[PDB]
Design a protein around this ligand. Sequence first.
Ligand SMILES: *C(=O)CSCCNC(=O)CCNC(=O)[C@H](O)C(C)(C)COP(=O)(O)OP(=O)(O)OC[C@H]1O[C@@H](n2cnc3c(N)ncnc32)[C@H](O)[C@@H]1OP(=O)(O)O
Ligand SMILES: [Zn+2]
Lengths: 8, 276
Amino acid sequence: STGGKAPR
Amino acid sequence: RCPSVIEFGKYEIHTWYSSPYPQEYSRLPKLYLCEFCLKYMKSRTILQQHMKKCGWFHPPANEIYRKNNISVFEVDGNVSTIYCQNLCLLAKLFLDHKTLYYDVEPFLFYVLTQNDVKGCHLVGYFSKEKHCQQKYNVSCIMILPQYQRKGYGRFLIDFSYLLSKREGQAGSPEKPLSDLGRLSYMAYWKSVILECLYHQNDKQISIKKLSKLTGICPQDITSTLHHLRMLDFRSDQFVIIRREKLIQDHMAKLQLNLRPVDVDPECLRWTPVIVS
Ligand SMILES: *C(=O)CSCCNC(=O)CCNC(=O)[C@H](O)C(C)(C)COP(=O)(O)OP(=O)(O)OC[C@H]1O[C@@H](n2cnc3c(N)ncnc32)[C@H](O)[C@@H]1OP(=O)(O)O
Ligand SMILES: [Zn+2]
């Protein structure tokens, strides 16, 4: 799934 | 900016970036953190009272690694959820592009500590997704300012490669890389490749073979070899040209300036294995 630096 | 300063163990530390601590603690300029459970409090008196009740002298997880006064604890976000959310809030004060702080359940957090008679003091950590479709072997990595430039970041980077290589797949850090991350990862990759070429004298090695032996993905090895000026191209693909004096001199510098903080594979209590 999306990581810890995944643009939000 | 918010908070601007934190108290953490025997140090008061300036923050680099804002972190979303709760409204009541949001507009607070200084936060007082428990160095063992990472609980955030508004005053020194509240912290002193907390320290008398707090039962933890190390992270709430088992010790995956221990050698001398150094330990790594493998913290599961789906088990020690509150601690991991507190760790994410702490890390956001020093990582501008970390966006995850609440949905910690799919992540593992490898917490590095330096140990003494007062306990296992948190030096830094690296998080990793349990199941990552992109094969990122590190999501976020942070060493606290007072512990930076001591070889702890290299240790954790090397530890992250020990895990991803033992689980049979090459990995890379999640992007973007901060300025310090760019310098740190390149120095790691360069040192690993140079020491690997030194030990593989009787082998015309390839990027593919270097990638398997080190766990560094092919594109990162290619970039590193480009930085080291050991790449040439004549026709189909890159050939590696060894610059012998670069290899031999790095190994000579390493023999005199030892690596005091160094991952010893024999000191991991449990190591990944690909299941049958
Ligand atoms: C996403 O999370 C990945 S990118 C963001 C991660 N880091 C980050 O920006 C958060 C704050 N910084 C850190 O936590 C920390 O600085 C690290 C983790 C980036 C690096 O860890 P260390 O500070 O402990 O680094 P060392 O292991 O001591 O150094 C390894 C080699 O890296 C080069 N280096 C490191 N800092 C440098 C500075 N300021 N200037 C030049 N070069 C630097 C050196 O080659 C260093 O080796 P030396 O033998 O030269 O010391
Ligand atoms: Zn506590």
